[PDB]
Design an enzyme around this catalytic site. Sequence first.
Site, PDB file in Angstrom:
ATOM      1  N   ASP A 139       8.047  13.871   7.147  1.00  0.00           N
ATOM      2  CA  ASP A 139       7.128  12.837   6.681  1.00  0.00           C
ATOM      3  C   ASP A 139       5.810  12.777   7.451  1.00  0.00           C
ATOM      4  O   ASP A 139       5.741  12.233   8.550  1.00  0.00           O
ATOM      5  CB  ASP A 139       7.900  11.511   6.770  1.00  0.00           C
ATOM      6  N   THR A 140       4.758  13.334   6.863  1.00  0.00           N
ATOM      7  CA  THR A 140       3.454  13.347   7.514  1.00  0.00           C
ATOM      8  C   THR A 140       2.756  11.987   7.525  1.00  0.00           C
ATOM      9  O   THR A 140       1.783  11.796   8.261  1.00  0.00           O
ATOM     10  CB  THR A 140       2.525  14.378   6.858  1.00  0.00           C
ATOM     11  N   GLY A 141       3.253  11.051   6.718  1.00  0.00           N
ATOM     12  CA  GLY A 141       2.664   9.722   6.667  1.00  0.00           C
ATOM     13  C   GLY A 141       3.265   8.775   7.697  1.00  0.00           C
ATOM     14  O   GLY A 141       2.785   7.664   7.881  1.00  0.00           O
TER      15      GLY A 141
HETATM   16  C1  MK1 Z   1       6.275   5.454  -2.398  1.00  0.00           C
HETATM   17  C2  MK1 Z   1       6.091   4.823  -1.009  1.00  0.00           C
HETATM   18  C3  MK1 Z   1       4.770   5.044  -0.617  1.00  0.00           C
HETATM   19  C4  MK1 Z   1       6.268   3.377  -1.207  1.00  0.00           C
HETATM   20  N1  MK1 Z   1       7.059   5.431  -0.106  1.00  0.00           N
HETATM   21  C5  MK1 Z   1       7.330   5.219   1.213  1.00  0.00           C
HETATM   22  O1  MK1 Z   1       6.735   4.387   1.904  1.00  0.00           O
HETATM   23  C6  MK1 Z   1       8.403   6.050   1.854  1.00  0.00           C
HETATM   24  C7  MK1 Z   1       9.664   5.198   1.941  1.00  0.00           C
HETATM   25  N2  MK1 Z   1      10.901   5.796   2.561  1.00  0.00           N
HETATM   26  C8  MK1 Z   1      12.112   4.986   2.406  1.00  0.00           C
HETATM   27  C9  MK1 Z   1      12.676   4.689   1.009  1.00  0.00           C
HETATM   28  C10 MK1 Z   1      12.681   3.349   0.573  1.00  0.00           C
HETATM   29  C11 MK1 Z   1      13.193   3.038  -0.717  1.00  0.00           C
HETATM   30  C12 MK1 Z   1      13.683   4.084  -1.532  1.00  0.00           C
HETATM   31  N3  MK1 Z   1      13.715   5.459  -1.171  1.00  0.00           N
HETATM   32  C13 MK1 Z   1      13.184   5.695   0.142  1.00  0.00           C
HETATM   33  C14 MK1 Z   1      10.605   6.079   3.911  1.00  0.00           C
HETATM   34  C15 MK1 Z   1       9.325   6.902   4.115  1.00  0.00           C
HETATM   35  N4  MK1 Z   1       8.167   6.379   3.314  1.00  0.00           N
HETATM   36  C16 MK1 Z   1       7.011   7.254   3.578  1.00  0.00           C
HETATM   37  C17 MK1 Z   1       6.081   6.722   4.661  1.00  0.00           C
HETATM   38  O2  MK1 Z   1       5.494   7.960   4.924  1.00  0.00           O
HETATM   39  C18 MK1 Z   1       4.904   5.780   4.356  1.00  0.00           C
HETATM   40  C19 MK1 Z   1       4.030   5.252   5.500  1.00  0.00           C
HETATM   41  C20 MK1 Z   1       2.896   4.320   4.971  1.00  0.00           C
HETATM   42  C21 MK1 Z   1       2.032   3.740   6.047  1.00  0.00           C
HETATM   43  C22 MK1 Z   1       1.256   4.586   6.902  1.00  0.00           C
HETATM   44  C23 MK1 Z   1       0.459   4.012   7.923  1.00  0.00           C
HETATM   45  C24 MK1 Z   1       0.442   2.590   8.085  1.00  0.00           C
HETATM   46  C25 MK1 Z   1       1.216   1.747   7.232  1.00  0.00           C
HETATM   47  C26 MK1 Z   1       2.009   2.330   6.215  1.00  0.00           C
HETATM   48  C27 MK1 Z   1       4.875   4.481   6.557  1.00  0.00           C
HETATM   49  O3  MK1 Z   1       5.831   3.741   6.227  1.00  0.00           O
HETATM   50  N5  MK1 Z   1       4.459   4.642   7.811  1.00  0.00           N
HETATM   51  C28 MK1 Z   1       5.056   3.963   8.957  1.00  0.00           C
HETATM   52  C29 MK1 Z   1       6.290   4.622   9.615  1.00  0.00           C
HETATM   53  C30 MK1 Z   1       7.399   5.263   9.107  1.00  0.00           C
HETATM   54  C31 MK1 Z   1       8.396   5.788   9.947  1.00  0.00           C
HETATM   55  C32 MK1 Z   1       8.315   5.669  11.370  1.00  0.00           C
HETATM   56  C33 MK1 Z   1       7.216   5.025  11.991  1.00  0.00           C
HETATM   57  C34 MK1 Z   1       6.222   4.497  11.182  1.00  0.00           C
HETATM   58  C35 MK1 Z   1       4.926   3.762  11.362  1.00  0.00           C
HETATM   59  C36 MK1 Z   1       4.072   3.887  10.125  1.00  0.00           C
HETATM   60  O4  MK1 Z   1       3.200   5.019  10.133  1.00  0.00           O
END
Ligand code: MK1
Lengths: 99, 99
Positions: free
Chosen positions: B25-27
Site C-alpha cells: 500500500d503506497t498510500g
Molecule cells: C477506497 C478507499 C480509498 C476508501 N480505500 C482505503 O482507504 C483502503 C482501505 N483498506 C481497508 C478496507 C476497508 C474496508 C473494506 N476493504 C478494505 C485499508 C487500506 N486503504 C488504503 C489506504 O492506502 C488509504 C490512505 C488514505 C490517506 C492517506 C493519507 C492521509 C489520510 C488518508 C490511508 O488510510 N492512509 C493512512 C494509513 C494506513 C495504514 C497505516 C498507517 C496510515 C496513516 C495514513 O497514511
Amino acid sequence: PQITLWKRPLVTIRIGGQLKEALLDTGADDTVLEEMNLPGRWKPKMIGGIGGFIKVRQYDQIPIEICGHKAIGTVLVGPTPTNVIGRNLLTQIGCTLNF
Amino acid sequence: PQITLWKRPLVTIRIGGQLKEALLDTGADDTVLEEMNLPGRWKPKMIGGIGGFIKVRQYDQIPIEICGHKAIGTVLVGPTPTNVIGRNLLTQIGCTLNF
Ligand SMILES: CC(C)(C)NC(=O)[C@@H]1CN(Cc2cccnc2)CCN1C[C@@H](O)C[C@@H](Cc1ccccc1)C(=O)N[C@H]1c2ccccc2C[C@H]1O
C-alpha cells in the site's frame, strides 16, 4: 516515470477542467476525491477505510488526466482528507509496483 | 518482481515465524497488521485515515520478510480491516511505482 516512496507519492491530476494533487495509492480499490461539484447523475455509496465507512457520491465515466496520462473511469466524491487515485485508474495508465 | 494492479497487490509476509498475507500500500505512511501477539514492548498510538482514527500498539525494530526481501522497522498492530505494508517498509525493500 519512476516514483520513489521516501515521501508520499503525490501527482498532479486534471479533472473537470481543474488541476489537483492526488496520492497514487496501490492500496485503494477505488478513486476517492475531495468534495467537488461535478456535473452528471451519481449514485450514493459507502466505502470503508482504516477508520470506518464514509458516504460518497459515485460518478461514472469521468475523464481524468494523471500526470499527463489520459484515463476515464469511476470516481467517488466524499469528505476525504486527500485525493486518492486507486487501482481502477492506475491500471489504465499502466502503473506497476517494482522491487 | 513487477506487480500489475488489476488485482489487489497481495504478498506473503513472514513475521514472528508466522506466515501472513498483506497488501502493498503506497498510500499508507505506516505498516499496520491485524491484531496478534508480537514479542517485545509496545506503546499506545493512534493513526487515522478514511473513516477516521483507530488505536494501535506500536512495536519497533521488528524483522519482517516481504515476498523474500528482509526489512526491519516499526510495525503497528490493531483493529485494521486488512494487513497493510506501508512506505516505511516499502522503501527498505526498494519498492517504486512505475508507469
Ligand atoms: C477506497 C478507499 C480509498 C476508501 N480505500 C482505503 O482507504 C483502503 C482501505 N483498506 C481497508 C478496507 C476497508 C474496508 C473494506 N476493504 C478494505 C485499508 C487500506 N486503504 C488504503 C489506504 O492506502 C488509504 C490512505 C488514505 C490517506 C492517506 C493519507 C492521509 C489520510 C488518508 C490511508 O488510510 N492512509 C493512512 C494509513 C494506513 C495504514 C497505516 C498507517 C496510515 C496513516 C495514513 O497514511
